[PDB]
């Protein structure tokens, strides 16, 4: 048992898919998962651990932003030895193409954050994803039949940014998805020599400021959780 | 409502009390608050508003880390016309004469995130808390016969810093507890014409490996908790 | 004796008043204290000793910029027992509300300095006076029945500066005051261990060039004296 | 015809190959493509033009370091038409497991140089390359029978670089080569909106100290241009 | 007049000599040059006017920190019609091979100011000084039987820096001399078109803090002295 | 010998000239200098060593941008012991005053580059020539009939910055031309002890947008160089 997660190894698979929203965990487990079993409930960041067509999985919450998704990435990885993290969170799109409910995968994670320059001696280090992870994810669409684009996020520290200049930055430099957490868990896996991913539905645009409502983020973004899922498995070959 | 909060204006009182965890905001509300009505539950961030002697406030979870408690205390305050912010949370002590339950204000918070700095040109903006709500908790504290040293707190970003040779920076400059949430909360209030404060229960000591008793635990909690409300009616007066 | 004051332990009371200007300390040493003697004129920088109220103090300049103050406050503290300083001097207004002949004491200090970046591993380093020290100035400044703002000042490295578009950053973050000296002193301060406070007379606002008269700044810059010396009788008691 | 490249609109095929040395573009026009034309001598920094089965490819050196490759690069995207560009380059190992001779690709790009943030308002850039000619050269490695590690490199300003130390910090996060270009010509891309790809051969061991010589580094890396040329065809289909 | 300089234009020559210690001013004025006339007494300021050799020329001093003679050089150039500006002021040594009394002039100043990255977009300021007016201190100083380093000076902002080793970097990149205003100077000069140089005389070594005894002390002083005003006379030729 | 310089000790002379192009380093030798020979060829970096009246003088591009020349600099003193580098090039002009086919020395060089921030602990190391050297230039073309402005350069990484404003902060603060390397080349010099210089002719105004046409832009670079030659005659004395 952690400090912040209130189970022992064995109680987490040793892959973990993971939304922002624990009660989005908690729909997955319920409508995904096989005989799932909550396996903690501290601050109330759900986690749980079932099966996906015979696969034993888990999904957690990791809360909002870099620093609360660190937290539990660590933990999970250095205490319940856990090999692979899938994000399947929520962005927010620039681009006029990305339209809402548009599913991106991040293999790269811009950020404004510092915590990757305090590992890196103050220098560029590019957040990536598990490579494997990419392709398994992007495999996995591909017979699902959902359409989905590969390429970088924004993992920013400030949902609400004092820089609306910096959005017209991402856009030029081809930003798919504005987010807050990609860049903190790719630095995480690095470190500590595990593997991640992140996987985003639009939910809303930053032009156009179509949007989706908060109980539709939380149980109708089907789409991602089974591209996730199923890439899981692909990648067990 | 926002994304993050489902409710309207007037479900919030004037001033929110907010620890980390939503469990202990629920606490609180049973505990202190009189007549609660959870006025949000969205990502399980729990939200109640009661009130305390004939005073109406609301206790709601922020999350763990600035980016987390930077989003609720935003919109709180833009969405809710929240005037007052009180964080209650607890933090770690490098100081050998900090003991540990020790109650820490902080009219000052230092980061290592890069939040302010993004604000600010990349200068050096203080973080700190509204002197008046500083006031109205020494005196609250005093008069519960609670000491309670004011300073400054640190508020990190990574909960598993790369960084030990920072403690001993932190100790050096008498920093009086380690948290992570101080000096954003700050830095909205800042930005939004607003006035927050944190205050925080030594937890855990960095330097002698102390930790608390469940017990003890959250009897502590409940001076900081008693100190954060007495201190709203005296700024009332 | 120091490389910047000819003299030796005992001279100086635990408690300094710091003017930038040394003819301003001297004027103090000669209208507010009695049986003041120098003790110190080194490079110009005079230094007194004497008595207020029964009570034993020191003034004296600290020159212009916080190179210069941390000199001298560092030399203060490490070499003739200084306990407590506090500076003050005046400062101009970006904010509406802050009216010229405003009284403003920096509970935090902002800076475009580098200095504390290098004292705090490069990260965010909240420059606080001491709170008794503020709360003390506060009661002082209301007995003489006198208004007082508690909030950030800015500390600039550049008196006449290049970059005009910061002073609405500074506006837009509530920043009461604009100095040269309030953050290198609290540096200074926790580096070594010492307590400091700076308290400033709006003597001018940066946007609409409204200036206070002589006879004003004069008037202020004496209440600020009383100020600085009452308060420094309340912590005594 | 470019400030840096004597030649007219056609002359390069849509897509490039480029080592840092001119010499070693001469080495693969001569032995990989057929009809091969020298399309530019300019600094004597040579450009060819030939046929791959069929396919139009050109090859041409971009010389050392980020400004330099920047240059040509850019050059080519927006006065040439080139919408693929494959770095087929040289790079140092610091990983125990990383061998002599070893083909990396380089699906993202640490570095320590400043143009990205430069580019990103000072933010972290994730400077990655297209999914699709990541893939494209993972799938033409595999029928090779030739091994290739996916992962990051590291653009270094510095060859000789001062600080040592750093060394350890790319172990540590799994760098798989040490470069000077391929951060660069990833900022290059996606700034311009085209497409591009590094792939390396380790010339040298940075901690065992073995290593190539000039002739071999310029004449024997030929797994590396097998599988460039053969991922230029896999993404045509 | 201004706020810091107590004259009008007229009063001072077009060029200036600057010491930081106002005594050291008046003491240049009375043993240098003829028929001196006080033109600024301001906060202890001590400015002369005189001549030399038939020459008009200023003396005065600039107080400690780049912040303080920023303000002074400033008001000089913009309101006084001043077109050349020497500083003549002390250096601590971390070369092994320079030696005390020894004289420096510095091409270059380096520092660990921001004043200089605010100006230059955060970029490097290569803070120079005039070519012309540092052969003439060469010439000036050869003619005297001076042998005369030319090099990098390095601009501190603190006096006592926490940061010891960074004389270790001084040293490896040759730097000649140590003081607090030379970067200060040179980037006004370059802000507000005019010239500026700054010579030194080693008075300390900063590894051995081995100090010039007070008898070498004026001794080397009035070397620096006449060096500068002879090559003032340089110049007008 | 290195990987990128296939000589040994005794091929260079204690002096190198170096232009960017290798096709002019071959023009020099063949123009300028008796009984070359080349003494490198790698990577189609040409070099040369021959006798300009009688004196022992090489030749040799160092490419385009600060890591380029950095690493033949480097390997010329270290491995070949050069004492003297006299980088010619070209440069852009913002300057108004400052016209067509000028020769501009920097004495000092500003630049957008990290590599002197990393060297340097991240403060502003002063990028400065060798003083002697800068003096013999522009004596030497004293005697040509050439006059020779000396000041600063700025080095830029990106020969296509995405960044319009700065040319008029290097106009505003004074910037003879602009290159890419005098400032990489200053800080190899000053890390391995040796001596630089870098010596340019304005080949285009960005102000008033002119160019040099061949038959002008030969007549200069002939002139450049029978400067930066003849400089070193006066060198040796």
Redesign the interface.
Known sequence: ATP?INAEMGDFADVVLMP????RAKYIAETFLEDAREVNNV????GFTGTYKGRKISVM?H??????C??YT?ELITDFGVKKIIRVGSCGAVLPHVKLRDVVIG??????????????????????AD?DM??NA?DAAKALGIDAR???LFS????????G??FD?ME???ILGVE?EA?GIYGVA??F?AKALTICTV??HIRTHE?T??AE?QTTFNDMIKIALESVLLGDK
């Open positions: 912040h922002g929203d624990p009660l601050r109330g960041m759900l919450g809360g909002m932003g870099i620093p609360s660190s937290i660590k293999m790269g994670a811009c950020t404004d954050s510092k915590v990757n320059r305090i590992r890196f001696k103050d220098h560029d280090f590019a957040a990536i490579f990419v392709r992007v590969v390429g970088n920013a520290d400030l949902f609400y940014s004092p820089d200049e910096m930055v030029k430099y081809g807050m860049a690095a470190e020599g939910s809303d949007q409502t908060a983020r």
